[PDB]
Amino acid sequence: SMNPPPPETSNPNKPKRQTNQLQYLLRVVLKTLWKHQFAWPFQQPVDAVKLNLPDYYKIIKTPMDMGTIKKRLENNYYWNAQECIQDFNTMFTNCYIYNKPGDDIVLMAEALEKLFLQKINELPTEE
Ligand SMILES: Cc1cc(-c2cc(CS(C)(=O)=O)cnc2Oc2ccc(F)cc2F)n2cc[nH]c(=O)c12
């Protein structure tokens, strides 16, 4: 029932980096997913109390959401782009585990996941 604390977006002891790939993930990949018509449920941690989903955090043990990912990109929380990509893949996998196929939320996540994959199919490089 209770909402756990949301995932950290800053850690003074974690080594940070900004790469061109990470800057792209923020400016292009995240901000394009953000504006999609299906993005709104994924823009903040799932509020199990508001939604009356006391089982949500009983089943989902590594929560993740694009709002968290956004703040992590903006705080250069990540070391490389694959760390970020893994937060996206965790967010989608969470949705498919907790829900069932055909659910409206699942249809939303599948659409987002395909757009996301289009956008990271080609990332930039550094010289
Ligand atoms: C990942 C995620 C996000 C949400 C969700 C989040 C918010 C925003 S907040 C501040 O209240 O948490 C509102 N409604 C939601 O549920 C929906 C339920 C039907 C639907 F068609 C569209 C939804 F967005 N849910 C709900 C159930 N399962 C999930 O995996 C899930």
PDB file of N, CA, C and O in Angstrom, residues 43-122:
ATOM      1  N   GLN A  43       5.471   9.559 -16.587  1.00  0.00           N
ATOM      2  CA  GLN A  43       6.197  10.796 -16.334  1.00  0.00           C
ATOM      3  C   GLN A  43       6.527  10.994 -14.866  1.00  0.00           C
ATOM      4  O   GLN A  43       7.207  11.975 -14.521  1.00  0.00           O
ATOM      5  N   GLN A  44       6.099  10.074 -14.012  1.00  0.00           N
ATOM      6  CA  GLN A  44       6.329  10.145 -12.580  1.00  0.00           C
ATOM      7  C   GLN A  44       6.189   8.740 -12.010  1.00  0.00           C
ATOM      8  O   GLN A  44       5.582   7.872 -12.646  1.00  0.00           O
ATOM      9  N   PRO A  45       6.776   8.468 -10.842  1.00  0.00           N
ATOM     10  CA  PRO A  45       6.600   7.143 -10.232  1.00  0.00           C
ATOM     11  C   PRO A  45       5.129   6.813 -10.099  1.00  0.00           C
ATOM     12  O   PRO A  45       4.279   7.702  -9.982  1.00  0.00           O
ATOM     13  N   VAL A  46       4.821   5.520 -10.142  1.00  0.00           N
ATOM     14  CA  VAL A  46       3.429   5.155  -9.990  1.00  0.00           C
ATOM     15  C   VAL A  46       3.042   5.388  -8.537  1.00  0.00           C
ATOM     16  O   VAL A  46       3.776   5.031  -7.601  1.00  0.00           O
ATOM     17  N   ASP A  47       1.937   6.093  -8.345  1.00  0.00           N
ATOM     18  CA  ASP A  47       1.469   6.471  -7.017  1.00  0.00           C
ATOM     19  C   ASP A  47       0.477   5.403  -6.580  1.00  0.00           C
ATOM     20  O   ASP A  47      -0.701   5.451  -6.926  1.00  0.00           O
ATOM     21  N   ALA A  48       0.956   4.411  -5.827  1.00  0.00           N
ATOM     22  CA  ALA A  48       0.096   3.285  -5.497  1.00  0.00           C
ATOM     23  C   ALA A  48      -1.064   3.708  -4.604  1.00  0.00           C
ATOM     24  O   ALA A  48      -2.132   3.097  -4.662  1.00  0.00           O
ATOM     25  N   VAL A  49      -0.887   4.757  -3.796  1.00  0.00           N
ATOM     26  CA  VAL A  49      -1.945   5.204  -2.887  1.00  0.00           C
ATOM     27  C   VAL A  49      -3.043   5.947  -3.639  1.00  0.00           C
ATOM     28  O   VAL A  49      -4.235   5.645  -3.483  1.00  0.00           O
ATOM     29  N   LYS A  50      -2.654   6.966  -4.418  1.00  0.00           N
ATOM     30  CA  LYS A  50      -3.591   7.644  -5.307  1.00  0.00           C
ATOM     31  C   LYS A  50      -4.369   6.645  -6.144  1.00  0.00           C
ATOM     32  O   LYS A  50      -5.605   6.665  -6.171  1.00  0.00           O
ATOM     33  N   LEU A  51      -3.659   5.753  -6.832  1.00  0.00           N
ATOM     34  CA  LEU A  51      -4.319   4.820  -7.734  1.00  0.00           C
ATOM     35  C   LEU A  51      -5.030   3.693  -7.009  1.00  0.00           C
ATOM     36  O   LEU A  51      -5.797   2.967  -7.645  1.00  0.00           O
ATOM     37  N   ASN A  52      -4.800   3.532  -5.707  1.00  0.00           N
ATOM     38  CA  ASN A  52      -5.361   2.418  -4.949  1.00  0.00           C
ATOM     39  C   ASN A  52      -4.879   1.089  -5.539  1.00  0.00           C
ATOM     40  O   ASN A  52      -5.666   0.220  -5.903  1.00  0.00           O
ATOM     41  N   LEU A  53      -3.555   0.950  -5.637  1.00  0.00           N
ATOM     42  CA  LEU A  53      -2.894  -0.271  -6.095  1.00  0.00           C
ATOM     43  C   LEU A  53      -1.935  -0.721  -5.003  1.00  0.00           C
ATOM     44  O   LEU A  53      -0.706  -0.614  -5.148  1.00  0.00           O
ATOM     45  N   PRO A  54      -2.466  -1.227  -3.887  1.00  0.00           N
ATOM     46  CA  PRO A  54      -1.580  -1.702  -2.815  1.00  0.00           C
ATOM     47  C   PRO A  54      -0.716  -2.874  -3.226  1.00  0.00           C
ATOM     48  O   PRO A  54       0.279  -3.157  -2.548  1.00  0.00           O
ATOM     49  N   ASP A  55      -1.039  -3.559  -4.320  1.00  0.00           N
ATOM     50  CA  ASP A  55      -0.166  -4.633  -4.763  1.00  0.00           C
ATOM     51  C   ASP A  55       0.951  -4.153  -5.680  1.00  0.00           C
ATOM     52  O   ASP A  55       1.850  -4.949  -5.976  1.00  0.00           O
ATOM     53  N   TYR A  56       0.933  -2.894  -6.140  1.00  0.00           N
ATOM     54  CA  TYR A  56       1.909  -2.512  -7.157  1.00  0.00           C
ATOM     55  C   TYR A  56       3.313  -2.742  -6.643  1.00  0.00           C
ATOM     56  O   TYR A  56       4.086  -3.502  -7.232  1.00  0.00           O
ATOM     57  N   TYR A  57       3.660  -2.104  -5.537  1.00  0.00           N
ATOM     58  CA  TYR A  57       5.021  -2.267  -5.066  1.00  0.00           C
ATOM     59  C   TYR A  57       5.226  -3.558  -4.305  1.00  0.00           C
ATOM     60  O   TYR A  57       6.320  -3.780  -3.792  1.00  0.00           O
ATOM     61  N   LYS A  58       4.213  -4.417  -4.234  1.00  0.00           N
ATOM     62  CA  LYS A  58       4.437  -5.773  -3.753  1.00  0.00           C
ATOM     63  C   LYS A  58       4.977  -6.671  -4.851  1.00  0.00           C
ATOM     64  O   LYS A  58       5.621  -7.683  -4.564  1.00  0.00           O
ATOM     65  N   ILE A  59       4.741  -6.309  -6.106  1.00  0.00           N
ATOM     66  CA  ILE A  59       5.159  -7.109  -7.252  1.00  0.00           C
ATOM     67  C   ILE A  59       6.328  -6.470  -7.993  1.00  0.00           C
ATOM     68  O   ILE A  59       7.176  -7.168  -8.542  1.00  0.00           O
ATOM     69  N   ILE A  60       6.372  -5.151  -8.034  1.00  0.00           N
ATOM     70  CA  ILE A  60       7.410  -4.425  -8.738  1.00  0.00           C
ATOM     71  C   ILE A  60       8.455  -4.047  -7.720  1.00  0.00           C
ATOM     72  O   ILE A  60       8.197  -3.229  -6.837  1.00  0.00           O
ATOM     73  N   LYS A  61       9.633  -4.635  -7.845  1.00  0.00           N
ATOM     74  CA  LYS A  61      10.676  -4.431  -6.859  1.00  0.00           C
ATOM     75  C   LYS A  61      11.766  -3.467  -7.302  1.00  0.00           C
ATOM     76  O   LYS A  61      12.550  -3.027  -6.455  1.00  0.00           O
ATOM     77  N   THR A  62      11.859  -3.144  -8.594  1.00  0.00           N
ATOM     78  CA  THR A  62      12.762  -2.104  -9.096  1.00  0.00           C
ATOM     79  C   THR A  62      11.950  -1.114  -9.910  1.00  0.00           C
ATOM     80  O   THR A  62      11.962  -1.153 -11.149  1.00  0.00           O
ATOM     81  N   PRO A  63      11.257  -0.197  -9.248  1.00  0.00           N
ATOM     82  CA  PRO A  63      10.456   0.795  -9.970  1.00  0.00           C
ATOM     83  C   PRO A  63      11.323   1.728 -10.796  1.00  0.00           C
ATOM     84  O   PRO A  63      12.493   1.960 -10.489  1.00  0.00           O
ATOM     85  N   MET A  64      10.727   2.279 -11.848  1.00  0.00           N
ATOM     86  CA  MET A  64      11.433   3.227 -12.698  1.00  0.00           C
ATOM     87  C   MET A  64      10.385   3.963 -13.519  1.00  0.00           C
ATOM     88  O   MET A  64       9.338   3.396 -13.838  1.00  0.00           O
ATOM     89  N   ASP A  65      10.659   5.228 -13.832  1.00  0.00           N
ATOM     90  CA  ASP A  65       9.712   6.072 -14.546  1.00  0.00           C
ATOM     91  C   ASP A  65      10.496   7.133 -15.300  1.00  0.00           C
ATOM     92  O   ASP A  65      11.619   7.465 -14.921  1.00  0.00           O
ATOM     93  N   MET A  66       9.890   7.705 -16.346  1.00  0.00           N
ATOM     94  CA  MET A  66      10.620   8.706 -17.116  1.00  0.00           C
ATOM     95  C   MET A  66      10.927   9.976 -16.336  1.00  0.00           C
ATOM     96  O   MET A  66      11.886  10.673 -16.683  1.00  0.00           O
ATOM     97  N   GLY A  67      10.141  10.311 -15.315  1.00  0.00           N
ATOM     98  CA  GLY A  67      10.488  11.461 -14.494  1.00  0.00           C
ATOM     99  C   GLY A  67      11.795  11.252 -13.755  1.00  0.00           C
ATOM    100  O   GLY A  67      12.669  12.127 -13.739  1.00  0.00           O
ATOM    101  N   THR A  68      11.947  10.086 -13.127  1.00  0.00           N
ATOM    102  CA  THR A  68      13.246   9.703 -12.572  1.00  0.00           C
ATOM    103  C   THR A  68      14.357   9.784 -13.622  1.00  0.00           C
ATOM    104  O   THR A  68      15.394  10.420 -13.396  1.00  0.00           O
ATOM    105  N   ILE A  69      14.156   9.140 -14.781  1.00  0.00           N
ATOM    106  CA  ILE A  69      15.170   9.147 -15.836  1.00  0.00           C
ATOM    107  C   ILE A  69      15.514  10.568 -16.245  1.00  0.00           C
ATOM    108  O   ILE A  69      16.683  10.897 -16.478  1.00  0.00           O
ATOM    109  N   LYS A  70      14.507  11.432 -16.341  1.00  0.00           N
ATOM    110  CA  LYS A  70      14.769  12.814 -16.712  1.00  0.00           C
ATOM    111  C   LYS A  70      15.705  13.474 -15.716  1.00  0.00           C
ATOM    112  O   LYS A  70      16.747  14.018 -16.097  1.00  0.00           O
ATOM    113  N   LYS A  71      15.354  13.438 -14.429  1.00  0.00           N
ATOM    114  CA  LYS A  71      16.204  14.066 -13.419  1.00  0.00           C
ATOM    115  C   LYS A  71      17.594  13.440 -13.395  1.00  0.00           C
ATOM    116  O   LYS A  71      18.592  14.142 -13.187  1.00  0.00           O
ATOM    117  N   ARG A  72      17.686  12.126 -13.626  1.00  0.00           N
ATOM    118  CA  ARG A  72      19.008  11.508 -13.667  1.00  0.00           C
ATOM    119  C   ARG A  72      19.837  12.030 -14.834  1.00  0.00           C
ATOM    120  O   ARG A  72      21.045  12.256 -14.691  1.00  0.00           O
ATOM    121  N   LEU A  73      19.213  12.239 -15.992  1.00  0.00           N
ATOM    122  CA  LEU A  73      19.952  12.808 -17.110  1.00  0.00           C
ATOM    123  C   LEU A  73      20.346  14.244 -16.811  1.00  0.00           C
ATOM    124  O   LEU A  73      21.481  14.650 -17.075  1.00  0.00           O
ATOM    125  N   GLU A  74      19.433  15.012 -16.221  1.00  0.00           N
ATOM    126  CA  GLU A  74      19.720  16.410 -15.940  1.00  0.00           C
ATOM    127  C   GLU A  74      20.781  16.587 -14.853  1.00  0.00           C
ATOM    128  O   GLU A  74      21.496  17.593 -14.864  1.00  0.00           O
ATOM    129  N   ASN A  75      20.892  15.648 -13.900  1.00  0.00           N
ATOM    130  CA  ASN A  75      21.948  15.647 -12.888  1.00  0.00           C
ATOM    131  C   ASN A  75      23.204  14.884 -13.322  1.00  0.00           C
ATOM    132  O   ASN A  75      24.061  14.594 -12.480  1.00  0.00           O
ATOM    133  N   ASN A  76      23.329  14.554 -14.604  1.00  0.00           N
ATOM    134  CA  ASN A  76      24.408  13.699 -15.088  1.00  0.00           C
ATOM    135  C   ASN A  76      24.648  12.522 -14.150  1.00  0.00           C
ATOM    136  O   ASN A  76      25.790  12.142 -13.894  1.00  0.00           O
ATOM    137  N   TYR A  77      23.558  11.944 -13.641  1.00  0.00           N
ATOM    138  CA  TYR A  77      23.633  10.789 -12.752  1.00  0.00           C
ATOM    139  C   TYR A  77      24.356   9.602 -13.381  1.00  0.00           C
ATOM    140  O   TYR A  77      24.977   8.807 -12.662  1.00  0.00           O
ATOM    141  N   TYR A  78      24.259   9.439 -14.700  1.00  0.00           N
ATOM    142  CA  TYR A  78      24.685   8.227 -15.389  1.00  0.00           C
ATOM    143  C   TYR A  78      26.164   8.269 -15.762  1.00  0.00           C
ATOM    144  O   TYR A  78      26.761   9.332 -15.931  1.00  0.00           O
ATOM    145  N   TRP A  79      26.740   7.079 -15.927  1.00  0.00           N
ATOM    146  CA  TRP A  79      28.095   6.959 -16.448  1.00  0.00           C
ATOM    147  C   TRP A  79      28.110   6.854 -17.970  1.00  0.00           C
ATOM    148  O   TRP A  79      28.932   7.491 -18.634  1.00  0.00           O
ATOM    149  N   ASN A  80      27.224   6.047 -18.546  1.00  0.00           N
ATOM    150  CA  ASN A  80      27.175   5.927 -19.992  1.00  0.00           C
ATOM    151  C   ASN A  80      25.730   5.730 -20.432  1.00  0.00           C
ATOM    152  O   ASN A  80      24.812   5.642 -19.611  1.00  0.00           O
ATOM    153  N   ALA A  81      25.539   5.660 -21.753  1.00  0.00           N
ATOM    154  CA  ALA A  81      24.189   5.658 -22.289  1.00  0.00           C
ATOM    155  C   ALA A  81      23.479   4.359 -21.965  1.00  0.00           C
ATOM    156  O   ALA A  81      22.255   4.347 -21.786  1.00  0.00           O
ATOM    157  N   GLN A  82      24.229   3.251 -21.874  1.00  0.00           N
ATOM    158  CA  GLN A  82      23.582   1.971 -21.619  1.00  0.00           C
ATOM    159  C   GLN A  82      23.008   1.904 -20.209  1.00  0.00           C
ATOM    160  O   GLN A  82      22.002   1.220 -19.990  1.00  0.00           O
ATOM    161  N   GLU A  83      23.615   2.612 -19.259  1.00  0.00           N
ATOM    162  CA  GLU A  83      23.024   2.719 -17.937  1.00  0.00           C
ATOM    163  C   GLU A  83      21.632   3.330 -18.028  1.00  0.00           C
ATOM    164  O   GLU A  83      20.675   2.817 -17.432  1.00  0.00           O
ATOM    165  N   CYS A  84      21.499   4.403 -18.818  1.00  0.00           N
ATOM    166  CA  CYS A  84      20.207   5.063 -19.026  1.00  0.00           C
ATOM    167  C   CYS A  84      19.221   4.149 -19.742  1.00  0.00           C
ATOM    168  O   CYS A  84      18.096   3.927 -19.269  1.00  0.00           O
ATOM    169  N   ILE A  85      19.655   3.581 -20.870  1.00  0.00           N
ATOM    170  CA  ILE A  85      18.838   2.647 -21.643  1.00  0.00           C
ATOM    171  C   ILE A  85      18.290   1.541 -20.749  1.00  0.00           C
ATOM    172  O   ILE A  85      17.133   1.132 -20.881  1.00  0.00           O
ATOM    173  N   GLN A  86      19.106   1.058 -19.808  1.00  0.00           N
ATOM    174  CA  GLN A  86      18.633   0.041 -18.872  1.00  0.00           C
ATOM    175  C   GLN A  86      17.493   0.565 -17.986  1.00  0.00           C
ATOM    176  O   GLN A  86      16.576  -0.190 -17.630  1.00  0.00           O
ATOM    177  N   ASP A  87      17.517   1.853 -17.615  1.00  0.00           N
ATOM    178  CA  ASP A  87      16.385   2.404 -16.861  1.00  0.00           C
ATOM    179  C   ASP A  87      15.127   2.446 -17.725  1.00  0.00           C
ATOM    180  O   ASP A  87      14.011   2.238 -17.232  1.00  0.00           O
ATOM    181  N   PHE A  88      15.281   2.735 -19.017  1.00  0.00           N
ATOM    182  CA  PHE A  88      14.124   2.666 -19.896  1.00  0.00           C
ATOM    183  C   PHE A  88      13.615   1.236 -19.991  1.00  0.00           C
ATOM    184  O   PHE A  88      12.413   0.999 -19.909  1.00  0.00           O
ATOM    185  N   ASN A  89      14.515   0.265 -20.182  1.00  0.00           N
ATOM    186  CA  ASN A  89      14.068  -1.121 -20.304  1.00  0.00           C
ATOM    187  C   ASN A  89      13.468  -1.631 -19.006  1.00  0.00           C
ATOM    188  O   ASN A  89      12.610  -2.517 -19.032  1.00  0.00           O
ATOM    189  N   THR A  90      13.914  -1.109 -17.865  1.00  0.00           N
ATOM    190  CA  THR A  90      13.313  -1.505 -16.597  1.00  0.00           C
ATOM    191  C   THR A  90      11.889  -0.971 -16.482  1.00  0.00           C
ATOM    192  O   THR A  90      10.979  -1.674 -16.029  1.00  0.00           O
ATOM    193  N   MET A  91      11.687   0.286 -16.879  1.00  0.00           N
ATOM    194  CA  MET A  91      10.358   0.886 -16.878  1.00  0.00           C
ATOM    195  C   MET A  91       9.366   0.074 -17.704  1.00  0.00           C
ATOM    196  O   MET A  91       8.232  -0.155 -17.276  1.00  0.00           O
ATOM    197  N   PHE A  92       9.757  -0.320 -18.926  1.00  0.00           N
ATOM    198  CA  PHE A  92       8.838  -1.062 -19.790  1.00  0.00           C
ATOM    199  C   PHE A  92       8.576  -2.457 -19.236  1.00  0.00           C
ATOM    200  O   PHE A  92       7.426  -2.894 -19.146  1.00  0.00           O
ATOM    201  N   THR A  93       9.640  -3.176 -18.877  1.00  0.00           N
ATOM    202  CA  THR A  93       9.488  -4.503 -18.295  1.00  0.00           C
ATOM    203  C   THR A  93       8.575  -4.482 -17.067  1.00  0.00           C
ATOM    204  O   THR A  93       7.695  -5.343 -16.920  1.00  0.00           O
ATOM    205  N   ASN A  94       8.759  -3.499 -16.178  1.00  0.00           N
ATOM    206  CA  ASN A  94       7.839  -3.343 -15.052  1.00  0.00           C
ATOM    207  C   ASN A  94       6.392  -3.345 -15.532  1.00  0.00           C
ATOM    208  O   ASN A  94       5.543  -4.042 -14.973  1.00  0.00           O
ATOM    209  N   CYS A  95       6.097  -2.590 -16.591  1.00  0.00           N
ATOM    210  CA  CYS A  95       4.713  -2.473 -17.040  1.00  0.00           C
ATOM    211  C   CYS A  95       4.176  -3.817 -17.523  1.00  0.00           C
ATOM    212  O   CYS A  95       3.016  -4.163 -17.263  1.00  0.00           O
ATOM    213  N   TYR A  96       5.008  -4.601 -18.210  1.00  0.00           N
ATOM    214  CA  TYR A  96       4.550  -5.883 -18.736  1.00  0.00           C
ATOM    215  C   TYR A  96       4.444  -6.946 -17.654  1.00  0.00           C
ATOM    216  O   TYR A  96       3.630  -7.872 -17.769  1.00  0.00           O
ATOM    217  N   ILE A  97       5.253  -6.839 -16.602  1.00  0.00           N
ATOM    218  CA  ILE A  97       5.145  -7.796 -15.510  1.00  0.00           C
ATOM    219  C   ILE A  97       3.874  -7.554 -14.717  1.00  0.00           C
ATOM    220  O   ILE A  97       3.080  -8.475 -14.489  1.00  0.00           O
ATOM    221  N   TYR A  98       3.680  -6.318 -14.256  1.00  0.00           N
ATOM    222  CA  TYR A  98       2.600  -6.035 -13.318  1.00  0.00           C
ATOM    223  C   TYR A  98       1.236  -6.168 -13.966  1.00  0.00           C
ATOM    224  O   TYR A  98       0.250  -6.464 -13.277  1.00  0.00           O
ATOM    225  N   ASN A  99       1.149  -5.916 -15.260  1.00  0.00           N
ATOM    226  CA  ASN A  99      -0.117  -5.897 -15.960  1.00  0.00           C
ATOM    227  C   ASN A  99      -0.235  -7.179 -16.779  1.00  0.00           C
ATOM    228  O   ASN A  99       0.495  -8.153 -16.562  1.00  0.00           O
ATOM    229  N   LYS A 100      -1.169  -7.202 -17.715  1.00  0.00           N
ATOM    230  CA  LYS A 100      -1.373  -8.360 -18.568  1.00  0.00           C
ATOM    231  C   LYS A 100      -1.543  -7.876 -19.994  1.00  0.00           C
ATOM    232  O   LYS A 100      -1.834  -6.699 -20.228  1.00  0.00           O
ATOM    233  N   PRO A 101      -1.325  -8.748 -20.976  1.00  0.00           N
ATOM    234  CA  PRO A 101      -1.419  -8.305 -22.369  1.00  0.00           C
ATOM    235  C   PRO A 101      -2.827  -7.840 -22.694  1.00  0.00           C
ATOM    236  O   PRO A 101      -3.811  -8.397 -22.208  1.00  0.00           O
ATOM    237  N   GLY A 102      -2.916  -6.802 -23.518  1.00  0.00           N
ATOM    238  CA  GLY A 102      -4.183  -6.205 -23.854  1.00  0.00           C
ATOM    239  C   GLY A 102      -4.597  -5.060 -22.960  1.00  0.00           C
ATOM    240  O   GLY A 102      -5.399  -4.223 -23.385  1.00  0.00           O
ATOM    241  N   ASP A 103      -4.090  -5.011 -21.730  1.00  0.00           N
ATOM    242  CA  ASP A 103      -4.370  -3.886 -20.846  1.00  0.00           C
ATOM    243  C   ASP A 103      -4.027  -2.574 -21.535  1.00  0.00           C
ATOM    244  O   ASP A 103      -3.045  -2.484 -22.284  1.00  0.00           O
ATOM    245  N   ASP A 104      -4.850  -1.552 -21.289  1.00  0.00           N
ATOM    246  CA  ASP A 104      -4.598  -0.249 -21.898  1.00  0.00           C
ATOM    247  C   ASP A 104      -3.192   0.255 -21.600  1.00  0.00           C
ATOM    248  O   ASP A 104      -2.530   0.817 -22.480  1.00  0.00           O
ATOM    249  N   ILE A 105      -2.723   0.086 -20.357  1.00  0.00           N
ATOM    250  CA  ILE A 105      -1.383   0.569 -20.023  1.00  0.00           C
ATOM    251  C   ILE A 105      -0.335  -0.165 -20.843  1.00  0.00           C
ATOM    252  O   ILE A 105       0.618   0.449 -21.336  1.00  0.00           O
ATOM    253  N   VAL A 106      -0.529  -1.473 -21.053  1.00  0.00           N
ATOM    254  CA  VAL A 106       0.421  -2.274 -21.824  1.00  0.00           C
ATOM    255  C   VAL A 106       0.487  -1.788 -23.255  1.00  0.00           C
ATOM    256  O   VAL A 106       1.578  -1.658 -23.831  1.00  0.00           O
ATOM    257  N   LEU A 107      -0.674  -1.513 -23.856  1.00  0.00           N
ATOM    258  CA  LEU A 107      -0.682  -0.973 -25.209  1.00  0.00           C
ATOM    259  C   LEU A 107       0.098   0.332 -25.262  1.00  0.00           C
ATOM    260  O   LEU A 107       0.864   0.573 -26.200  1.00  0.00           O
ATOM    261  N   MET A 108      -0.067   1.176 -24.248  1.00  0.00           N
ATOM    262  CA  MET A 108       0.705   2.409 -24.187  1.00  0.00           C
ATOM    263  C   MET A 108       2.200   2.128 -24.104  1.00  0.00           C
ATOM    264  O   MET A 108       2.995   2.770 -24.793  1.00  0.00           O
ATOM    265  N   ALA A 109       2.610   1.187 -23.246  1.00  0.00           N
ATOM    266  CA  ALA A 109       4.044   0.935 -23.086  1.00  0.00           C
ATOM    267  C   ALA A 109       4.645   0.358 -24.364  1.00  0.00           C
ATOM    268  O   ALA A 109       5.745   0.742 -24.773  1.00  0.00           O
ATOM    269  N   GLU A 110       3.932  -0.564 -25.012  1.00  0.00           N
ATOM    270  CA  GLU A 110       4.429  -1.154 -26.249  1.00  0.00           C
ATOM    271  C   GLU A 110       4.647  -0.093 -27.316  1.00  0.00           C
ATOM    272  O   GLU A 110       5.662  -0.107 -28.021  1.00  0.00           O
ATOM    273  N   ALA A 111       3.712   0.854 -27.429  1.00  0.00           N
ATOM    274  CA  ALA A 111       3.889   1.936 -28.387  1.00  0.00           C
ATOM    275  C   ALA A 111       5.092   2.788 -28.025  1.00  0.00           C
ATOM    276  O   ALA A 111       5.886   3.158 -28.897  1.00  0.00           O
ATOM    277  N   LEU A 112       5.239   3.119 -26.745  1.00  0.00           N
ATOM    278  CA  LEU A 112       6.403   3.883 -26.329  1.00  0.00           C
ATOM    279  C   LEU A 112       7.681   3.100 -26.563  1.00  0.00           C
ATOM    280  O   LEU A 112       8.682   3.659 -27.028  1.00  0.00           O
ATOM    281  N   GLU A 113       7.663   1.797 -26.265  1.00  0.00           N
ATOM    282  CA  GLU A 113       8.891   1.023 -26.382  1.00  0.00           C
ATOM    283  C   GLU A 113       9.347   0.939 -27.828  1.00  0.00           C
ATOM    284  O   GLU A 113      10.550   0.916 -28.094  1.00  0.00           O
ATOM    285  N   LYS A 114       8.415   0.933 -28.778  1.00  0.00           N
ATOM    286  CA  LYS A 114       8.831   0.862 -30.176  1.00  0.00           C
ATOM    287  C   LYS A 114       9.401   2.192 -30.647  1.00  0.00           C
ATOM    288  O   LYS A 114      10.456   2.220 -31.276  1.00  0.00           O
ATOM    289  N   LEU A 115       8.755   3.304 -30.308  1.00  0.00           N
ATOM    290  CA  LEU A 115       9.340   4.620 -30.581  1.00  0.00           C
ATOM    291  C   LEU A 115      10.728   4.774 -29.953  1.00  0.00           C
ATOM    292  O   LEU A 115      11.656   5.296 -30.582  1.00  0.00           O
ATOM    293  N   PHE A 116      10.869   4.386 -28.685  1.00  0.00           N
ATOM    294  CA  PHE A 116      12.162   4.434 -28.014  1.00  0.00           C
ATOM    295  C   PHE A 116      13.218   3.667 -28.805  1.00  0.00           C
ATOM    296  O   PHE A 116      14.310   4.180 -29.067  1.00  0.00           O
ATOM    297  N   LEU A 117      12.890   2.450 -29.238  1.00  0.00           N
ATOM    298  CA  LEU A 117      13.850   1.652 -29.991  1.00  0.00           C
ATOM    299  C   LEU A 117      14.194   2.298 -31.327  1.00  0.00           C
ATOM    300  O   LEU A 117      15.350   2.238 -31.763  1.00  0.00           O
ATOM    301  N   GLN A 118      13.213   2.928 -31.990  1.00  0.00           N
ATOM    302  CA  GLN A 118      13.520   3.703 -33.191  1.00  0.00           C
ATOM    303  C   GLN A 118      14.553   4.772 -32.887  1.00  0.00           C
ATOM    304  O   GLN A 118      15.467   5.025 -33.680  1.00  0.00           O
ATOM    305  N   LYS A 119      14.405   5.434 -31.741  1.00  0.00           N
ATOM    306  CA  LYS A 119      15.234   6.604 -31.472  1.00  0.00           C
ATOM    307  C   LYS A 119      16.653   6.222 -31.066  1.00  0.00           C
ATOM    308  O   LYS A 119      17.596   6.944 -31.402  1.00  0.00           O
ATOM    309  N   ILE A 120      16.835   5.100 -30.356  1.00  0.00           N
ATOM    310  CA  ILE A 120      18.180   4.667 -29.967  1.00  0.00           C
ATOM    311  C   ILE A 120      18.816   3.712 -30.976  1.00  0.00           C
ATOM    312  O   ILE A 120      19.962   3.281 -30.766  1.00  0.00           O
ATOM    313  N   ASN A 121      18.119   3.369 -32.066  1.00  0.00           N
ATOM    314  CA  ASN A 121      18.724   2.510 -33.087  1.00  0.00           C
ATOM    315  C   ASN A 121      20.023   3.114 -33.625  1.00  0.00           C
ATOM    316  O   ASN A 121      20.993   2.392 -33.883  1.00  0.00           O
ATOM    317  N   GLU A 122      20.068   4.437 -33.774  1.00  0.00           N
ATOM    318  CA  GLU A 122      21.289   5.153 -34.115  1.00  0.00           C
ATOM    319  C   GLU A 122      21.511   6.255 -33.091  1.00  0.00           C
ATOM    320  O   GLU A 122      20.694   7.175 -32.980  1.00  0.00           O
TER     321      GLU A 122
END
